[PDB]
Amino acid sequence: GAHLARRYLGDASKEPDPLRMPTFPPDYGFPERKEREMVATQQEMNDAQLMLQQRDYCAHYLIQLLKCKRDSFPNFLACKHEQHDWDYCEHLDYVKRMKEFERERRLLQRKKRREQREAEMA
Amino acid sequence: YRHSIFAVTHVLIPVWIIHYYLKYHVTAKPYTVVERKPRIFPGDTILETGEVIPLMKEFPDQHH
Amino acid sequence: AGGGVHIEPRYRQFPQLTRSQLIQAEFFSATMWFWILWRFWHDSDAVLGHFPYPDPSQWTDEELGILPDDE
Amino acid sequence: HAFFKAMLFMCSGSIIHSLNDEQDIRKMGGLYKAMPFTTTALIIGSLALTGMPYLTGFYSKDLIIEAVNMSYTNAWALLMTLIATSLTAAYSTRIIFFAFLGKPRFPPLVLINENNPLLINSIKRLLIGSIFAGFIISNNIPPMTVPNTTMPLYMKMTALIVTIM
Amino acid sequence: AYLTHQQKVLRLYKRALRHLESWCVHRDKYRYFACLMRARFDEHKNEKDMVKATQLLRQAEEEFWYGQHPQPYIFPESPGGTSYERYECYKVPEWCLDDWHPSEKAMYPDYFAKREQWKRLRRESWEREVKQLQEETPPGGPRTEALPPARKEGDLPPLWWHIVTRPRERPM
Amino acid sequence: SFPKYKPSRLATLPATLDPAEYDISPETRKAQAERLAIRSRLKREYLLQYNDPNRLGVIEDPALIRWTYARSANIYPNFRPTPKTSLLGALFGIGPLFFWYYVFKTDRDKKEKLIQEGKLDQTFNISY
Amino acid sequence: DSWDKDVYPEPPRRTPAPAPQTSLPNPVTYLTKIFDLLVDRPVTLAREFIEQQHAKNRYYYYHREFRRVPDITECEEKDILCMFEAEMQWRRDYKVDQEIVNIIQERLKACQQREGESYRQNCAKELEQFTQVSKAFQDRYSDLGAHYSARKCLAKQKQRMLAERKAAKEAAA
Amino acid sequence: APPLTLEAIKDRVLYVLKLYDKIDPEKLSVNSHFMKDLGLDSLDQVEIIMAMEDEFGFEIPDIDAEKLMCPQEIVDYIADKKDVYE
Amino acid sequence: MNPFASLTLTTLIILTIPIMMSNSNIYKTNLYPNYVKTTVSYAFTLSLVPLLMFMHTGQEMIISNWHWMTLQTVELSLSFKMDYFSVMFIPVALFVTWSIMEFSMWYMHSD
Amino acid sequence: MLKIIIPTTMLLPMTWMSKHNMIWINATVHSLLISLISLSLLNQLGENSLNFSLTFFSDSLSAPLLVLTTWLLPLMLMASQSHLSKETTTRKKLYITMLILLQLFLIMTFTATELILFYILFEATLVPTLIIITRWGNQTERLNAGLYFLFYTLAGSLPLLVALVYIQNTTGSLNFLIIHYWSHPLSNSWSNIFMWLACIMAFMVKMPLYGLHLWLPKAHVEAPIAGSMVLAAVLLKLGGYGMMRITTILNPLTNYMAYPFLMLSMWGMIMTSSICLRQTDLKSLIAYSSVSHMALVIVAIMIQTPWSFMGATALMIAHGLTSSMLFCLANTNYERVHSRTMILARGLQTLLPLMATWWLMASLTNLALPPSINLIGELFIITASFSWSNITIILMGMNMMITALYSLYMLITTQRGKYTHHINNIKASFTRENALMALHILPLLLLTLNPKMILGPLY
Amino acid sequence: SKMELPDYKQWKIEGTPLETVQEKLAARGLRDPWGRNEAWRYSGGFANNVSFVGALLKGFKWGFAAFVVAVGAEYYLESQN
């Protein structure tokens, strides 16, 4: 919404392009940026036969969700802390994307006016 | 009793002749019935071989 | 007409209402009532979110790691 | 949708049978007290289509509005969805007003009745369906897509509010 | 024949008020508006020379033509109604009874007994009524579809059978 | 009474907005006397057989046989080689066949031109 | 089973043995148990009658054999005897080749359900195996026409073999 | 629909015609000529006939609406409309 | 796999039995509406069980038994794929029709 | 095949010296027995056609048509019983002789070995139908009907004769087995085009094809009912059986000159189906329907794909059972009402319960509900045509939609609605025409169970 | 079985919102004679219908009572356990 206004009714280059960004090396600006690591191995996703869109980094919690659920039968009112870890993982992973969105945003913000500063000093 | 005669002459004698049909004639043909592999858990065990699939290490445990 | 008429219609007056259709009616609306406040009290974190939405602006350039603007 | 859409269908039909095979709203009215069981049934189902929290419509319609909003669509795709929710609710309130509220714009012979046992029992199982099913099924079905956790608040609450004006 | 001047306005006034109750919906609101238009209808009840009322016709008929509801309340048995021409799938012509196997006719014995005398009643009546209708009709045929009465002695109304043996409106 | 409804071929002028409704001339109202008379006898003769118990089977409907005979037989005897008829004959004749001839020929030529050097999607097609 | 895994390879089946830590006992376990001993038991002994009756009088049926005859390539023009033999031999080989495509599709389809949502990564081997068979089938019998015959296929085989011969010399350069 | 017989219909129309404030109860008759016995005008005749329109539910053709004069033949008209005999 | 797929086959044939009895003209046309009630309600009753193992282990399969056409390379056979969508829709559909025609017995009776 | 030929010709003496009242019983029972004997012809090997004799052979294409003819013959026998009661015995036996002679020529036509022998009995069917159409017709126009039907078929028949005898002098034989086995590519020389042409319009004039179809509405709507079924059910298909035969040698010419007939047909059924929707006579619709259904067959044969040939065979047999049913259905209404106007007798469900069903799936088979063999033939044509050209789909898909449009239209305008009160002669539906429809419909669903027997030799 | 027709004396404009219709028309020298036909609908048991919020409020009184003792029961486990 707000970023939509800053691109459509504002400057498109100022806002990140959702289908193109990021456009800067993530290691650039973070010397020794540690890799977002995997908890559930390839065979974990493979043996669980998880679907691709839910085979993200949070899938390590997701397999735990089903396994309490597949063992909570009969009951369905159990299985609460399992998602509490999962949606929080998706909550923080969405923040990671959001942080990457703002990272590229202020990446575009900084360099454009830095180049504008060069355009001003010449 | 009417419910009972309903079951035998409309439900009970069916479940016999479908069961007779597929578990002796249909399953006797290859790939007639194919069942997906259940989601075997690293951490759970296999019933026939007794092999417990090794589970992954500690989760991030990001308790809210 | 034929034997079996029991519900007797009226003419411009409020019709008779057997208690059975009433008592279940407010019972069902009560049943559909107390279900959602019990669900509300038990799981208020369902209709409304359970995980906060951090504001974008408050994020400083540390996790953003934007190298300084002057250079 | 199959639950409550059907659920209001024979409830409307129960009104039609009781009120001498009439369909126009402009001849309904005053049926709240005189049509008790159907009145509750239609009242619930009218905004059950809109799906108040913790209902068949809640776990589907409210999530649908957020899901399209929390995704990559054309600018007008979302706006029709909120327009849908508002416009659907507006006449969802309308048909109650003409049917039960107001005054009985119906012929003087007061035949209006719903004492038939099959009438009550057929709809009765659809009260428990149209209200309980969304909760039980939602916890009975594992999620298929990534849940929408970090969300900028308003585009979820918008689905609930666009229903009430 | 031709629709008379005060007859045409009665037709237009008919559905115009049905349009009004379609618009007003509420009974009291309709009653208030129906009486207001009643006096409006009575505003120029006088017409004197017929040419003035023809112009008054044009404005009046133009009013009620636009006065239609977009979806006027058509009754279930109204032409185009929900229950209109609904049970025609059940009514069957009376002559089909003669095309019944004797078993069915015998298992409905009293009805076919009174059907037989009704069939007999059709015979002499048709005989008497046709020699009644031919001379009751003046030269040049029938000037109108109105059909002459059974004004003779011991005579049935001419051209009655299909009217009397009409498929009852509730065939069930 | 408002901006008036314009009559159309598939939705004609109503019985209200028609000028003849309020423009009833002495001869126009006079016309609705003999058309009623012929309808009266026409309705009469139908009743003299429809209500006739002696009559059995089906009575002839002159208009229906007039419609069928004119819709089936009397078109060629009334047909003329009029240039207009030949014009509509031509554009609805060889026209559409040449339309679909070119379309399918162009499609086939455009389709065929890539088969001989392997530029189509045919790998999973061994049925024809 | 009558069929063997060399013809129809069935991926091995594992059973994730449960662990119902929940207070309520599982409803499925005895629901399948009752279904077992109120329906299966009557039909098991009934089948035992059927299997034992088959053993009482077991007749025999064999498999029809076909002695190979000279091919259309070695057959004679305008000679209706030999080339008819090659014609029928070619048609039978077509029917067998049709069924080879059937089996590999059956094996491929069986793979997809076996791997479930992992069909994309765990069915590539069966897919490519069918792919090369289908490609070989396309240059084999496809495009011949409704009036296909041994001579018509031989012309197609010769046309393909001369095209690649010209291509091979072109590749030699 | 219950077997609505003419006796119910006959009572309803005369009651409504008595209910009609311009056809007073004491001056209402079974054969009430609206033009002569009751002295109403054409528009009131429309109001009378379309009052029983909504009051009875069924439809009165316009070519039969203006003809229908008296409550007795109002009763007979609805009598032949459904074909009541009891 | 002994339940579930077999149970679905039982559910979809018991609904045909009313038609088979109807065309056999041995059924009684009077209580047939009520006879239809019992069939649909029962067919719904056996529709719940195929859910139970899907909640339990989530197994899904395809039933293809009687081969109709060989059509050279493309064999044709009657085949039902029971997945998440099909499995839990049958009780939803079965419950709906049982209730709506339960209402329709009182409503649709004057014909 | 003389195990079918000899009993069939033996029907002539038996039907010609039977009793004055047993001619119907005797002819019906033994014709059905011939059908049962003909059912044994369903057996086919992998690809070898059953070569019973030098002059007779059959395969998976001839036998389904063979059974169709033999199974059909009792159906006009029972259909004609209605309107042939008011006739002398000698003339009645003459009618039976024409039908049996028509059957006998049909079996020899399908079982023929070489093309010339096939051609002789093929055309020979014109004579029995010419007498049937003209002598026993109903209206003045039937005289113009016979000439239109005769000359149209003959005008295309004679060029084929010249081409056929030309085959014998060039190839050396006209036997189908040798022609296919000694098949040689046909050059594109300007003479060879006419050579290709002369072997085509003979088959497509009686298909019928768009443009060259006017005899179809002028005969089927106008022939006696018994002649109407055999004309629509089988006689049109005589072009189909020939075209699968003659196409074995006429290659690769079909690639070029199929076009002028292809879109002539492709615009054809859509055009014809439009005429069906806007008819006024009952039998005129089914006649116009028959050419519309026959039109997709023309595309099926000409496109020369194995899938289309199977679709051609299935649609061929399915249409025969259908078109016979609707023509029988129209005859039932025409008899009581003594006319064939569509809206003359609308709304007869209230008086004709079983007929309204016999309307119902007969039209539904005309709509081709799944999995009726009509679609199995129709869908196979679609896949073959789509593989030929993608843009094909819109046309005949639109056609089978306008096909759907009318195929309920007479159902609405004959059964749905209110009876005509002046009509009072619709009596109780006699079991004869009633059971006639049963014998029409049950084989359709029976063949639906195991269609694998009617896809022809390409299956 | 009774099909009885009640008294007309109870059904004129009184006891109904038809007061205003009777006088507002009477303000412009008019009379409303058909309000008595709709007097029963605007009176008797058919009058005084609950509001829309009150329409959904039906069953709240017992629903609220069931709700509070249910969450009181909810507090029961977290205290007793």
PDB file of N, CA and C in Angstrom, chain B residues 3-4 6-7 9-11 14-15 17-19 21-22 26 29 31-36 38-39, chain I residues 1-2 6 9-10 13-14 17 21 35 38-39 42 46 57-66:
ATOM      1  N   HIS B   3     -34.462 -51.455   9.463  1.00  0.00           N
ATOM      2  CA  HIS B   3     -33.100 -50.974   9.264  1.00  0.00           C
ATOM      3  C   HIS B   3     -32.135 -52.138   9.084  1.00  0.00           C
ATOM      4  N   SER B   4     -32.335 -53.219   9.841  1.00  0.00           N
ATOM      5  CA  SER B   4     -31.462 -54.383   9.721  1.00  0.00           C
ATOM      6  C   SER B   4     -31.601 -55.048   8.356  1.00  0.00           C
ATOM      7  N   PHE B   6     -32.578 -53.618   5.755  1.00  0.00           N
ATOM      8  CA  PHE B   6     -31.960 -52.670   4.840  1.00  0.00           C
ATOM      9  C   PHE B   6     -30.465 -52.924   4.729  1.00  0.00           C
ATOM     10  N   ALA B   7     -29.802 -53.135   5.868  1.00  0.00           N
ATOM     11  CA  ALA B   7     -28.351 -53.278   5.861  1.00  0.00           C
ATOM     12  C   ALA B   7     -27.914 -54.529   5.108  1.00  0.00           C
ATOM     13  N   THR B   9     -29.574 -56.467   2.805  1.00  0.00           N
ATOM     14  CA  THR B   9     -29.972 -56.555   1.407  1.00  0.00           C
ATOM     15  C   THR B   9     -29.592 -55.322   0.596  1.00  0.00           C
ATOM     16  N   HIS B  10     -28.962 -54.324   1.212  1.00  0.00           N
ATOM     17  CA  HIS B  10     -28.499 -53.151   0.480  1.00  0.00           C
ATOM     18  C   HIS B  10     -27.089 -52.704   0.827  1.00  0.00           C
ATOM     19  N   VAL B  11     -26.537 -53.102   1.971  1.00  0.00           N
ATOM     20  CA  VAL B  11     -25.209 -52.653   2.373  1.00  0.00           C
ATOM     21  C   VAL B  11     -24.322 -53.848   2.680  1.00  0.00           C
ATOM     22  N   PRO B  14     -23.635 -56.139  -0.376  1.00  0.00           N
ATOM     23  CA  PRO B  14     -22.645 -55.439  -1.205  1.00  0.00           C
ATOM     24  C   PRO B  14     -21.214 -55.572  -0.704  1.00  0.00           C
ATOM     25  N   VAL B  15     -20.934 -55.151   0.535  1.00  0.00           N
ATOM     26  CA  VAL B  15     -19.545 -55.057   0.990  1.00  0.00           C
ATOM     27  C   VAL B  15     -18.827 -56.386   0.794  1.00  0.00           C
ATOM     28  N   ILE B  17     -19.443 -58.463  -1.971  1.00  0.00           N
ATOM     29  CA  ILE B  17     -19.144 -58.790  -3.365  1.00  0.00           C
ATOM     30  C   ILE B  17     -18.210 -57.760  -3.992  1.00  0.00           C
ATOM     31  N   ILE B  18     -18.117 -56.554  -3.426  1.00  0.00           N
ATOM     32  CA  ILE B  18     -17.010 -55.683  -3.807  1.00  0.00           C
ATOM     33  C   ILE B  18     -15.702 -56.221  -3.248  1.00  0.00           C
ATOM     34  N   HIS B  19     -15.699 -56.629  -1.976  1.00  0.00           N
ATOM     35  CA  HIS B  19     -14.474 -57.154  -1.379  1.00  0.00           C
ATOM     36  C   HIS B  19     -14.013 -58.411  -2.103  1.00  0.00           C
ATOM     37  N   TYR B  21     -14.583 -58.901  -5.110  1.00  0.00           N
ATOM     38  CA  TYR B  21     -14.200 -58.466  -6.448  1.00  0.00           C
ATOM     39  C   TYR B  21     -12.758 -57.973  -6.491  1.00  0.00           C
ATOM     40  N   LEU B  22     -12.378 -57.060  -5.593  1.00  0.00           N
ATOM     41  CA  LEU B  22     -11.109 -56.376  -5.813  1.00  0.00           C
ATOM     42  C   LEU B  22      -9.923 -57.086  -5.177  1.00  0.00           C
ATOM     43  N   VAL B  26      -9.164 -57.958  -8.882  1.00  0.00           N
ATOM     44  CA  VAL B  26      -8.540 -56.697  -9.264  1.00  0.00           C
ATOM     45  C   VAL B  26      -7.091 -56.656  -8.794  1.00  0.00           C
ATOM     46  N   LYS B  29      -4.276 -58.297 -10.736  1.00  0.00           N
ATOM     47  CA  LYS B  29      -3.682 -57.669 -11.901  1.00  0.00           C
ATOM     48  C   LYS B  29      -2.668 -56.607 -11.454  1.00  0.00           C
ATOM     49  N   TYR B  31      -0.658 -53.217 -10.886  1.00  0.00           N
ATOM     50  CA  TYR B  31      -0.908 -51.779 -10.835  1.00  0.00           C
ATOM     51  C   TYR B  31      -2.388 -51.421 -10.886  1.00  0.00           C
ATOM     52  N   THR B  32      -3.279 -52.387 -10.657  1.00  0.00           N
ATOM     53  CA  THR B  32      -4.705 -52.076 -10.621  1.00  0.00           C
ATOM     54  C   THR B  32      -5.031 -51.132  -9.478  1.00  0.00           C
ATOM     55  N   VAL B  33      -4.443 -51.368  -8.310  1.00  0.00           N
ATOM     56  CA  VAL B  33      -4.544 -50.473  -7.166  1.00  0.00           C
ATOM     57  C   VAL B  33      -3.135 -50.075  -6.751  1.00  0.00           C
ATOM     58  N   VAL B  34      -2.887 -48.771  -6.672  1.00  0.00           N
ATOM     59  CA  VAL B  34      -1.585 -48.243  -6.287  1.00  0.00           C
ATOM     60  C   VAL B  34      -1.786 -47.230  -5.170  1.00  0.00           C
ATOM     61  N   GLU B  35      -1.120 -47.457  -4.041  1.00  0.00           N
ATOM     62  CA  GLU B  35      -1.257 -46.630  -2.852  1.00  0.00           C
ATOM     63  C   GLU B  35       0.002 -45.797  -2.659  1.00  0.00           C
ATOM     64  N   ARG B  36      -0.181 -44.519  -2.341  1.00  0.00           N
ATOM     65  CA  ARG B  36       0.954 -43.628  -2.162  1.00  0.00           C
ATOM     66  C   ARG B  36       1.758 -44.015  -0.927  1.00  0.00           C
ATOM     67  N   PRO B  38       3.200 -43.536   2.508  1.00  0.00           N
ATOM     68  CA  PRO B  38       2.883 -42.660   3.639  1.00  0.00           C
ATOM     69  C   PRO B  38       4.089 -41.832   4.052  1.00  0.00           C
ATOM     70  N   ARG B  39       3.806 -40.702   4.694  1.00  0.00           N
ATOM     71  CA  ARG B  39       4.862 -39.773   5.072  1.00  0.00           C
ATOM     72  C   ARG B  39       5.675 -40.337   6.229  1.00  0.00           C
TER      73      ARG B  39
ATOM     74  N   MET I   1      -5.248 -50.057   3.706  1.00  0.00           N
ATOM     75  CA  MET I   1      -5.685 -50.076   2.322  1.00  0.00           C
ATOM     76  C   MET I   1      -6.773 -51.143   2.105  1.00  0.00           C
ATOM     77  N   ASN I   2      -7.019 -51.987   3.100  1.00  0.00           N
ATOM     78  CA  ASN I   2      -8.157 -52.897   3.062  1.00  0.00           C
ATOM     79  C   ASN I   2      -9.473 -52.126   3.258  1.00  0.00           C
ATOM     80  N   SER I   6     -11.902 -49.692  -0.731  1.00  0.00           N
ATOM     81  CA  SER I   6     -13.021 -50.623  -0.824  1.00  0.00           C
ATOM     82  C   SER I   6     -14.304 -49.981  -0.317  1.00  0.00           C
ATOM     83  N   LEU I   9     -15.853 -47.744  -2.880  1.00  0.00           N
ATOM     84  CA  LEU I   9     -16.554 -48.534  -3.887  1.00  0.00           C
ATOM     85  C   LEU I   9     -17.899 -49.020  -3.365  1.00  0.00           C
ATOM     86  N   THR I  10     -17.970 -49.358  -2.078  1.00  0.00           N
ATOM     87  CA  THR I  10     -19.254 -49.730  -1.496  1.00  0.00           C
ATOM     88  C   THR I  10     -20.211 -48.544  -1.473  1.00  0.00           C
ATOM     89  N   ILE I  13     -21.819 -47.694  -5.019  1.00  0.00           N
ATOM     90  CA  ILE I  13     -22.728 -48.663  -5.622  1.00  0.00           C
ATOM     91  C   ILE I  13     -24.053 -48.722  -4.866  1.00  0.00           C
ATOM     92  N   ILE I  14     -24.032 -48.547  -3.541  1.00  0.00           N
ATOM     93  CA  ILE I  14     -25.268 -48.615  -2.771  1.00  0.00           C
ATOM     94  C   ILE I  14     -26.216 -47.487  -3.141  1.00  0.00           C
ATOM     95  N   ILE I  17     -28.297 -48.732  -6.131  1.00  0.00           N
ATOM     96  CA  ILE I  17     -29.266 -49.782  -5.812  1.00  0.00           C
ATOM     97  C   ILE I  17     -30.701 -49.263  -5.874  1.00  0.00           C
ATOM     98  N   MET I  21     -33.395 -51.047  -8.202  1.00  0.00           N
ATOM     99  CA  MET I  21     -34.706 -51.473  -7.725  1.00  0.00           C
ATOM    100  C   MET I  21     -35.822 -50.717  -8.435  1.00  0.00           C
ATOM    101  N   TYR I  35     -37.693 -44.835   1.286  1.00  0.00           N
ATOM    102  CA  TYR I  35     -36.638 -45.787   0.960  1.00  0.00           C
ATOM    103  C   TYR I  35     -35.406 -45.066   0.432  1.00  0.00           C
ATOM    104  N   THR I  38     -33.447 -43.641   3.440  1.00  0.00           N
ATOM    105  CA  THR I  38     -32.600 -44.613   4.116  1.00  0.00           C
ATOM    106  C   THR I  38     -31.331 -44.884   3.318  1.00  0.00           C
ATOM    107  N   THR I  39     -31.448 -44.958   1.991  1.00  0.00           N
ATOM    108  CA  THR I  39     -30.277 -45.206   1.156  1.00  0.00           C
ATOM    109  C   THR I  39     -29.265 -44.074   1.272  1.00  0.00           C
ATOM    110  N   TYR I  42     -27.810 -43.839   4.803  1.00  0.00           N
ATOM    111  CA  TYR I  42     -26.830 -44.907   4.966  1.00  0.00           C
ATOM    112  C   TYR I  42     -25.593 -44.647   4.121  1.00  0.00           C
ATOM    113  N   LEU I  46     -21.844 -44.731   5.572  1.00  0.00           N
ATOM    114  CA  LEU I  46     -20.610 -45.362   5.122  1.00  0.00           C
ATOM    115  C   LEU I  46     -19.663 -44.383   4.444  1.00  0.00           C
ATOM    116  N   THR I  57      -3.615 -41.575   8.650  1.00  0.00           N
ATOM    117  CA  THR I  57      -2.353 -41.648   7.933  1.00  0.00           C
ATOM    118  C   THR I  57      -2.340 -40.866   6.629  1.00  0.00           C
ATOM    119  N   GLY I  58      -3.488 -40.380   6.161  1.00  0.00           N
ATOM    120  CA  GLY I  58      -3.510 -39.575   4.957  1.00  0.00           C
ATOM    121  C   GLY I  58      -3.272 -40.331   3.674  1.00  0.00           C
ATOM    122  N   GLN I  59      -3.559 -41.629   3.646  1.00  0.00           N
ATOM    123  CA  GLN I  59      -3.292 -42.417   2.451  1.00  0.00           C
ATOM    124  C   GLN I  59      -4.240 -42.025   1.324  1.00  0.00           C
ATOM    125  N   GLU I  60      -3.706 -41.998   0.105  1.00  0.00           N
ATOM    126  CA  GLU I  60      -4.485 -41.727  -1.093  1.00  0.00           C
ATOM    127  C   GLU I  60      -4.068 -42.713  -2.171  1.00  0.00           C
ATOM    128  N   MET I  61      -5.022 -43.094  -3.019  1.00  0.00           N
ATOM    129  CA  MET I  61      -4.747 -44.077  -4.056  1.00  0.00           C
ATOM    130  C   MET I  61      -5.719 -43.876  -5.213  1.00  0.00           C
ATOM    131  N   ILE I  62      -5.556 -44.702  -6.244  1.00  0.00           N
ATOM    132  CA  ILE I  62      -6.405 -44.690  -7.428  1.00  0.00           C
ATOM    133  C   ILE I  62      -6.874 -46.113  -7.682  1.00  0.00           C
ATOM    134  N   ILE I  63      -8.169 -46.276  -7.930  1.00  0.00           N
ATOM    135  CA  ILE I  63      -8.766 -47.582  -8.179  1.00  0.00           C
ATOM    136  C   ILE I  63      -9.100 -47.681  -9.660  1.00  0.00           C
ATOM    137  N   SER I  64      -8.420 -48.586 -10.361  1.00  0.00           N
ATOM    138  CA  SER I  64      -8.686 -48.865 -11.771  1.00  0.00           C
ATOM    139  C   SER I  64      -8.713 -50.378 -11.927  1.00  0.00           C
ATOM    140  N   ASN I  65      -9.897 -50.938 -12.170  1.00  0.00           N
ATOM    141  CA  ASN I  65     -10.098 -52.376 -12.069  1.00  0.00           C
ATOM    142  C   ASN I  65     -10.395 -53.038 -13.409  1.00  0.00           C
ATOM    143  N   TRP I  66     -11.438 -52.605 -14.108  1.00  0.00           N
ATOM    144  CA  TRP I  66     -11.930 -53.293 -15.295  1.00  0.00           C
ATOM    145  C   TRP I  66     -11.539 -52.495 -16.532  1.00  0.00           C
TER     146      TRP I  66
END
